[PDB]
Design an enzyme around this catalytic site. Structure first.
Site, PDB file in Angstrom:
ATOM      1  N   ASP A   1      -1.099   7.824  -7.754  1.00  0.00           N
ATOM      2  CA  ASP A   1      -1.268   6.386  -7.910  1.00  0.00           C
ATOM      3  C   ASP A   1      -2.691   6.133  -8.398  1.00  0.00           C
ATOM      4  OD1 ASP A   1      -1.219   3.649  -7.869  1.00  0.00           O
ATOM      5  OD2 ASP A   1      -0.728   3.457  -5.738  1.00  0.00           O
TER       6      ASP A   1
ATOM      7  N   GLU B   1      -0.173   7.433   0.159  1.00  0.00           N
ATOM      8  CA  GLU B   1       0.049   6.539   1.297  1.00  0.00           C
ATOM      9  C   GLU B   1       1.016   7.077   2.340  1.00  0.00           C
ATOM     10  OE1 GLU B   1       0.523   2.335   0.940  1.00  0.00           O
ATOM     11  OE2 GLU B   1      -0.744   2.268  -0.867  1.00  0.00           O
TER      12      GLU B   1
ATOM     13  N   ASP C   1       4.225   4.029   0.201  1.00  0.00           N
ATOM     14  CA  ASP C   1       3.883   2.802   0.916  1.00  0.00           C
ATOM     15  C   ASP C   1       4.095   2.907   2.430  1.00  0.00           C
ATOM     16  OD1 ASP C   1       2.988   0.217   1.229  1.00  0.00           O
ATOM     17  OD2 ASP C   1       4.886  -0.722   0.622  1.00  0.00           O
TER      18      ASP C   1
END
Lengths: 324, 324
Positions: free
Chosen positions: A233, A120, A90
């Site tokens: 992910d 990310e 993230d």
């Protein structure tokens, strides 16, 4: 007229023979194929007992290659383990980015995986992740982009090829990052991806997933005996998961489908993001193929950082250990 | 209870929808997969029009990999020819062996194939065949044996591997001789064999054939884009031919199944061997796979040698030229 003509054998019975019972079929199949009646018994009971197609199956069917090899012609991995970790860190969350990235590097060093998939990743405050280069070889999918993925491998891991495929149906810069290498004499393929996000992007995500499984299927066909790891992910909902190719398994499922390690994005338990109502999903998954058949599966990165009171990421990290 | 919980979207219609007609299916399939209705129309008419399994097919079925590649992502061989020749030269016939072997070398030099498969080669009077080494690289399957096979390749042909597999069900020293190499940037595999002889050895011959086709199937799966040539004296009767793998074709059949080039062992026309009644068979065959799709096929070695009034062999040689 233009039919073949067979060689005459002078002391051979001068009439070709010509329906029958089930034991006659057993015997006939045995004589013709020069195999026993017990083996005959296996084939004929997967079809009506049609002798003709039983023969075609024995000689032509791909299922019976082992049987043909036995008729014509007549491991080192015990004690070997490899751990794979995957974490959407993230980076797009600017809050406490540097502190969180430091925690990420700390957690990676404690878990000490042989192979690490990151999603990310951003350029900003990347320093603590770059510090891992003392322990890992680091491969970034798409540097220069707002965000991208990484594959980090142990120094023992020889790398032959690094390829990045950009999904053309993606409005989020998503890619398939492929690392081809080997650990010792064992060939290894790594496929890391961050599939299209949000429920609404199901069409893009599902197409991407099936495309990725096509690539896995190609690698397996061209590299018998190789270890293949695909995941990241995937943003998957359970009903979205299409058919996975033969010999491919979900790591969490093969570890026993533990409810205590199921959800990897859980707003009931992770408050990095807050909705009016909690949500939870198994977004992060790992698939594998190859000569290792057992797996342990745990979640990591579940401790709140003490200096800033948040978790390293809104995702838990998944950590799978494969062995024989 | 341990089911996933979906993210709430505040401005989304707050009810999931729920049988339908054929045009509703067309539209639904189109919206879900983000593909058009014309493409939808293709899939749904290969099943009852079951939308559910139409989806599973689009995402999971191996047949639709191209479609998925198009949904996610959106030759040099013109002018290239290669000729393959195969000849059981009947070295086990001692009559006029030296003269016949000289004729064989002469015929090989006139036909000038890039690749030559020989069967029934013996040590005795091998000199004229060994002389071909000025033009060819020569690989003998099993030297030291009463008889064996050979593969000869043009000097331009780079060789990486030479393997010989001995059929354990053979009482005639039969083998599968495999040469792996390349012509320029194009990978090439050569598989030469002399399958078990005589009608009575059908069980051994048929098992061997299916085993050989298993090997061809493995090579093709592991080497996309490669040229594969398999053949030799297969001793086949037409009804013995089991299923050949996908993308594999018989050279004589792909050339148009010419009756004038069908039989390769013909005692009506070749009197090297004599029975009370003539016999004739397509014993010698050539199969191929790869990025060449056209083929010319002729028989060679059909002229009687003038010094001793016999043919070079009781077999005709087969000569296939593959091009794009």
């Amino acid at each position: 007229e233009d039919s073949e003509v067979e060689i005459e054998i002078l002391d051979e019975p001068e009439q070709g023979k010509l329906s029958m019972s089930d034991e006659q079929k057993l015997h006939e199949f045995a004589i013709i194929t020069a195999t026993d009646e017990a083996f005959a018994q296996s084939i004929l009971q997967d079809v009506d007992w049609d002798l003709k197609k039983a023969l075609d199956v024995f000689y032509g069917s791909e299922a019976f290659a082992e049987a043909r090899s036995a008729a014509v012609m007549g491991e080192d991995l015990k004690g070997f383990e490899v751990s794979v970790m995957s974490w959407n860190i993230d980076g797009l969350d600017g809050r406490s980015l540097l502190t969180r990235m430091k925690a990420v590097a700390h957690i990676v060093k404690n878990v000490n995986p042989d192979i690490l998939f990151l999603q990310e990743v951003v350029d900003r405050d990347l320093a603590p992740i770059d510090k891992l280069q003392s322990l890992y070889k680091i491969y970034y999918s798409n540097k220069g982009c707002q965000y991208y993925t990484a594959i980090l491998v142990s120094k023992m891991f020889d790398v032959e090829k690094h390829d990045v495929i950009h999904f053309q149906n993606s409005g989020m810069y998503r890619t398939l990052q492929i690392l081809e290498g080997s650990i010792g004499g064992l060939k290894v393929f790594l496929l890391n991806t961050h599939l299209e996000s949000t429920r609404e992007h199901r069409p893009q995500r599902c197409a991407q997933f099936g495309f990725c499984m096509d690539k896995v299927r190609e690698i397996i066909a061209q590299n018998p005996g190789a270890l293949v790891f695909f995941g990241g992910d995937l943003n998957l909902r359970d009903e979205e998961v299409s058919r996975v190719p033969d010999g491919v398994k979900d790591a969490w499922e093969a570890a026993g489908s533990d409810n205590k390690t199921k959800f990897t994005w859980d707003t009931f338990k992770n408050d990095n993001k807050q909705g009016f109502h909690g949500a939870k999903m198994r977004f992060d998954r790992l698939y594998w193929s190859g000569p290792l058949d057992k797996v342990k599966f745990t979640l990591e990165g579940r401790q709140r950082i003490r200096s800033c009171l948040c978790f390293p990421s809104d995702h838990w990290a998944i950590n799978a250990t494969f062995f024989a």
